Structure formats: structure tokens, C-alpha cells
Design an enzyme around this catalytic site. Structure first.
Site, short mmCIF file in Angstrom:
data_model
loop_
_atom_site.label_atom_id
_atom_site.label_comp_id
_atom_site.label_asym_id
_atom_site.label_seq_id
_atom_site.Cartn_x
_atom_site.Cartn_y
_atom_site.Cartn_z
N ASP A 100 -3.31 -52.16 -26.35
CA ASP A 100 -2.31 -51.82 -25.32
C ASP A 100 -2.81 -50.66 -24.47
OD1 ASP A 100 -0.87 -53.33 -27.25
OD2 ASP A 100 0.91 -52.13 -27.14
N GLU A 107 9.01 -56.81 -25.77
CA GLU A 107 8.09 -55.67 -25.72
C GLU A 107 7.62 -55.31 -24.32
OE1 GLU A 107 4.85 -56.96 -28.57
OE2 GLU A 107 6.10 -55.77 -29.92
#
Ligand SMILES: [Ca+2]
Length: 440
Positions: A53, A309
Site C-alpha cells: 500500500d 478499504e
């Protein structure tokens, strides 16, 4: 249980809309393009770490910031052998550069001692640093938001901020340390689930999935906000048996509710659905980045999934666009499979809503490659651009710990065209790995 209808004044990812996606996603306009594995490189400055990420330092409106002639990207990285080794590193390139090889590594943002020096009860129990956002303040400071994960306290997740002090020269950036390092929000029970509520259920072995993460900074009219992944609380439509009878979570009609609800109640997904109460939450912050106001969620995903998310929101050409990533494997929708992974998207005339689905259903991106595929991508994120009808989609490529020689790395970026309430992937718009802007 009698059927009822209650929206809690917020928007909803409905069962009806989700059910349309399996047929819709066959359209290439909503598909992560195929990437070419022989062009893919590890981040050379990250020295055998997995890098997943990742997020750019952004201006308040979501465009990419220029820090003293550099772009900055924060990313989760760690040892591929240890699934619990997760810290935030800061990478940087000179503005104008595009090659993955241009990304230098300034190392970790935090020292191990920083969480203790912060004088912060929650922070001193942290075991991992999960992802977030970063904004470039009007007085020239790097302001980080991320998720403090406590592995030893049943996976507590706390929205957290710090200022990162960085010296700039003609050749390098150097992290000198951090300050104003503090917990901002750990849920309130009524609007967003807290960790105690997760523990009340029996934590992990209950099947519940507690989230309070992916903090995304944005401003509007000089007010400061975080939009984040969460789950609902007791007062805005909580998880439970009763939730399956709320028609707001189904949409379409009462006919559709009766048919779908009875199928769900007879299915092996009834319990999963009952526990599913994902939300994209919102709080306003003060000017010192502490909590001003807990606000109602922009959207929730009751019955559909517990896990939406990588919250993201920005204004582009007069409209507000709200996005989230989500795995088919944790949804309860017929025809969505364990291979399917999505970026879903919603649009409003205002930051605070109401939000309606993009492309009629919410589908923006679909990625359904085998987890073993080197070009598998995840954590898709739309980076707003200064002008035009395109945003840049970043993501990480290659699953963590899968291959000895091929680590999680920056995926090739690509373009997503946005106009009104419609999106399309731009044909043959693949850019360099980790490229943040169209402009060079
Ligand atoms: Ca839940």
C-alpha cells in the site's frame, strides 16, 4: 422479525446494485488493464523488501504535492518472510522523473522509540503501521495520517497523525524525526465500531472483522476532514440478526427485498451477512489535527461486506467522487467470486453527500487475476490531477511473500476517465510503475 426500512440518513451499497456487477464487469471499460510481466521491476532502493500500500503526499484537494522539487510517496514495507512486519517508509523522486528507478528510499518514517516518546497510551502498544494518507500543509509541513495497529490488543486500529520533519537538498531528502505524533480516533461505539465491541463478539473466532483504518485527508471550504474505513456502530445500523430485514440494504423494491432476503436467510452466507457492516466514515479535525467532530458515515455496506478499504474522496470538475476497494471473497453476493476484487465508486454534488453509484451499480474497477499471477494488483487508488478528465490509478503489484525474486512493488499506473456519473478505463493508458501524474 418484521421487515422495516431505515437509511439512518446515509447512503448504502445495496444488494441490488452489487448483483448487477458480475454481468457488467465483462465490459473492458471497468477492468484493470492487463500488464506486461517482463517490464516489471522491484523497487531497487527498497533492497529486497516487499512494498505494498503506497500513497503520495497530496495538497489539500488531492492533487500531488511538490516538496522542495520532489514527489514523495509513503508505503508499507517489510520482510517478505514475516507477514506481521509492517512499517511506513518514505520514497521520493525529483519532479519530472518517471522511472521506477528514480524512487530513492529515505527509510522508515518512525523510530521504534517514537511511539513511547509520543506520550500516547494507545501508541505505546502499537505493533504495526498500516496505511493512510499525507497532506502538505499551507506552512510547508509533511502531515501524515496512518493506522496504528495493536496486534496484542485484539487488532485495535487507531487513526493517528504525525508531522514528518524532512530536510531537502539538491541531491536528497532526509528524515530528521517526527513531532505532533498522536492518536486522533479509535471509534465511539455509536457511529463507528470500537475494538471493545469486536472483543464483545469473541474477536477473530466470532467471524466479525473490525476495521478502523485507511485515513484519507481532504478539505472543503477550509474545514479539515478524514474519510476512513470503518464499521457502523449501534446508532447508524449495526451488525446483527435484525439487520437482514432492513430494506435500505437491499434497494430496488419490496418484491426484491422479499426474494433476496429469504434466499440470504436460507444460505450459508446468513451469518457473514449479519456481521457485515462496513462503512466509509468521516470526522472533522481541528487546525492542530485533533478531533473536532464525529460525523455520520458517507456510505455503509451492511449485509454485503464488513470490509471496504482504501477510502478516497476528492472534488473533480464540479462533483465529488468517493471510492473504496473491496474483495469479492468477503462479500455475500451471488455471482461475485473469490477471485473478484473491486474499486467501487460513488458521486455527489457535495463532500458530505448524498452519494449515488457510478456507472449505475458502483463498479469502477475489476481485477480477477489468480493470487499467484505476478501482475496481480491490489489497493487501487485514484490520484486526482490538476486539470482534465483523467485521474491516475496507482496500486501495488505482486502478492506479499509469494516469490523470492519478485517482491510487492509499484504497479504500472494507468488512467481512469471520469465525467458526470460515469467512468471508463482509458485504452492503452499504462504508465511507468508508481507514476503519480500525467504531467512530467
Ligand atoms: Ca462487522
Amino acid at each position: 422479525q418484521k421487515p422495516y426500512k431505515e437509511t439512518y440518513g446515509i447512503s448504502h451499497i445495496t444488494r441490488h446494485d452489487m448483483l448487477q456487477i458480475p454481468e457488467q464487469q465483462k465490459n473492458e471499460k471497468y477492468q484493470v488493464p492487463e500488464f506486461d510481466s517482463s517490464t516489471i521491476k522491484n523497487i531497487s532502493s527498497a533492497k529486497g523488501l516487499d512494498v505494498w500500500d503506497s500513497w503520495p503526499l497530496q495538497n489539500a484537494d488531492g492533487t500531488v504535492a511538490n516538496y522542495h522539487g520532489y514527489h514523495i510517496v509513503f508505503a508499507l514495507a517489510g520482510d517478505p518472510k514475516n507477514a506481521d512486519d509492517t512499517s511506513i517508509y518514505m520514497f521520493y523522486q525529483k519532479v519530472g522523473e518517471t522511472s521506477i528507478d528514480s524512487w530513492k528510499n529515505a527509510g522508515r518514517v518512525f523510530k521504534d522509540s517514537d511511539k513511547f516518546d509520543a506520550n500516547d497510551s494507545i501508541l505505546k502498544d502499537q505493533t504495526q503501521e498500516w496505511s493512510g494518507s499525507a497532506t502538505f500543509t499551507s506552512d510547508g509541513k509533511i502531515r501524515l495520517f496512518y493506522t496504528d495497529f495493536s496486534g496484542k490488543h485484539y487488532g485495535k486500529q487507531t487513526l493517528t497523525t504525525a508531522q514528518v520533519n524532512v530536510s531537502a537538498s539538491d541531491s536528497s531528502l532526509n528524515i530528521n524525526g517526527v513531532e505532533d505524533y498522536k492518536s486522533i480516533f479509535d471509534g465511539d461505539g455509536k457511529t463507528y465500531q470500537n475494538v471493545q465491541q469486536f472483543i464483545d463478539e469473541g474477536n477473530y473466532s466470532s467471524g466479525d472483522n473490525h476495521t478502523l483504518r485507511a485515513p484519507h485527508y481532504v478539505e472543503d471550504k477550509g474545514h479539515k476532514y478524514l474519510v476512513f474505513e470503518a464499521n457502523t456502530g449501534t446508532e447508524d445500523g449495526y451488525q446483527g440478526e435484525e439487520s437482514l430485514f432492513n430494506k435500505a440494504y437491499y434497494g430496488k423494491s419490496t418484491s426484491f427485498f422479499r426474494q433476496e432476503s429469504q434466499k440470504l436467510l436460507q444460505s450459508d452466507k446468513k451469518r457473514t451477512a449479519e456481521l457485515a457492516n462496513g462503512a466509509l466514515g468521516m470526522i472533522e479535525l481541528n487546525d492542530d489535527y485533533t478531533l473536532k467532530k464525529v460525523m455520520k458515515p458517507l456510505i455503509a455496506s451492511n449485509t454485503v461486506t464488513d470490509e471496504i478499504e482504501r477510502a478516497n474522496v476528492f472534488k473533480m470538475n464540479g462533483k465529488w467522487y468517493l471510492f473504496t476497494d473491496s474483495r469479492g471473497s468477503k462479500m455475500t453476493i451471488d455471482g461475485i467470486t473469490s477471485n473478484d476484487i473491486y474499486m467501487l465508486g460513488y458521486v455527489s454534488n457535495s463532500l458530505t453527500g448524498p452519494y449515488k453509484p457510478l456507472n449505475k451499480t458502483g463498479l469502477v474497477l475489476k481485477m480477477d487475476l489468480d493470487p499467484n499471477d505476478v501482475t496481480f494488483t491490489y489497493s487501487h487508488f485514484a490520484v486526482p490531477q490538476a486539470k482534465g478528465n483523467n485521474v491516475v490509478i496507482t496500486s501495488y503489484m505482486t502478492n506479499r511473500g509469494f516469490y523470492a525474486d519478485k517482491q510487492s512493488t509499484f504497479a504500472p499506473s494507468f488512467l481512469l476517465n471520469i465525467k458526470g456519473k460515469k467512468t471508463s478505463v482509458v485504452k492503452d493508458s499504462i504508465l511507468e510503475q508508481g507514476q503519480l501524474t500525467v504531467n512530467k
